[PDB]
C-alpha cells in the first residue's frame, strides 16, 4: 500500500525585507565665548 | 596687612571704587567707631573685603 502518504518540504512563504534607519545631525558650528577685563596699576 | 592694604586701597580708588576704611575715613570714624562699622555692616548692598 505504497500510496499511503508523501513527503513534504516546508518553506516560509511571505518573506519580507527592509532597510535600517540611521540618525544623523544636520550642520555644525561653534560660536566663540567672551572673556577678559584689564588689570590696573 | 596694613602696608599692602594701603596699596590695595589705592588700586581700588584708581578704579573708581568707593572704599571705606578706618585709616582714610578717620574723621568720620572718629565721631563714633561703632556707628561707622554698623553703617556698612547693616547695608546689604555693601561688599565686604576681608584681608587674610
UniProtKB/Swiss-Prot annotation, chain A:
Widely expressed. Glycosylated. The modification Phosphoserine is found at residue 37. Forms heterodimers with IL17RC; the heterodimer binds IL17A and IL17F homodimers as well as the heterodimer formed by IL17A and IL17F. Forms complexes with 2:1 binding stoichiometry: two receptor chains for one interleukin molecule. IL17A homodimer preferentially drives the formation of IL17RA-IL17RC heterodimeric receptor complex, whereas IL17F homodimer forms predominantly complexes with IL17RC homodimer. (Microbial infection) Interacts with SARS coronavirus-2/SARS-CoV-2 virus protein ORF8. It is linked to Immunodeficiency 51: A primary immunodeficiency disorder with altered immune responses and impaired clearance of fungal infections, selective against Candida. It is characterized by persistent and/or recurrent infections of the skin, nails and mucous membranes caused by organisms of the genus Candida, mainly Candida albicans. Receptor for IL17A and IL17F, major effector cytokines of innate and adaptive immune system involved in antimicrobial host defense and maintenance of tissue integrity. Receptor for IL17A. Receptor for IL17F. Binds to IL17A with higher affinity than to IL17F. Binds IL17A and IL17F homodimers as part of a heterodimeric complex with IL17RC. Also binds heterodimers formed by IL17A and IL17F as part of a heterodimeric complex with IL17RC. This is Interleukin-17 receptor A. It comes from Homo sapiens (Human). The gene is IL17RA.
Curated annotation (Swiss-Prot), chain B:
Widely expressed. Coiled coil: none annotated. Interacts with IKBKG/NF-kappa B essential modulator, with CHUK/IKK-alpha and with IKBKB/IKK-beta. Interacts with TRAF6; this interaction is direct. Interacts with IL17RA and IL17RC. Interacts with IL17RB. It is linked to Psoriasis 13: A common, chronic inflammatory disease of the skin with multifactorial etiology. It is characterized by red, scaly plaques usually found on the scalp, elbows and knees. These lesions are caused by abnormal keratinocyte proliferation and infiltration of inflammatory cells into the dermis and epidermis. Candidiasis, familial, 8: A primary immunodeficiency disorder with altered immune responses and impaired clearance of fungal infections, selective against Candida. It is characterized by persistent and/or recurrent infections of the skin, nails and mucous membranes caused by organisms of the genus Candida, mainly Candida albicans. E3 ubiquitin ligase that catalyzes 'Lys-63'-linked polyubiquitination of target protein, enhancing protein-protein interaction and cell signaling. Transfers ubiquitin from E2 ubiquitin-conjugating enzyme UBE2V1-UBE2N to substrate protein. Essential adapter molecule in IL17A-mediated signaling. Upon IL17A stimulation, interacts with IL17RA and IL17RC receptor chains through SEFIR domains and catalyzes 'Lys-63'-linked polyubiquitination of TRAF6, leading to TRAF6-mediated activation of NF-kappa-B and MAPkinase pathways. This is E3 ubiquitin ligase TRAF3IP2. It comes from Homo sapiens (Human). The gene is TRAF3IP2. The chain holds residues 420 to 471 of 574 of the full protein.
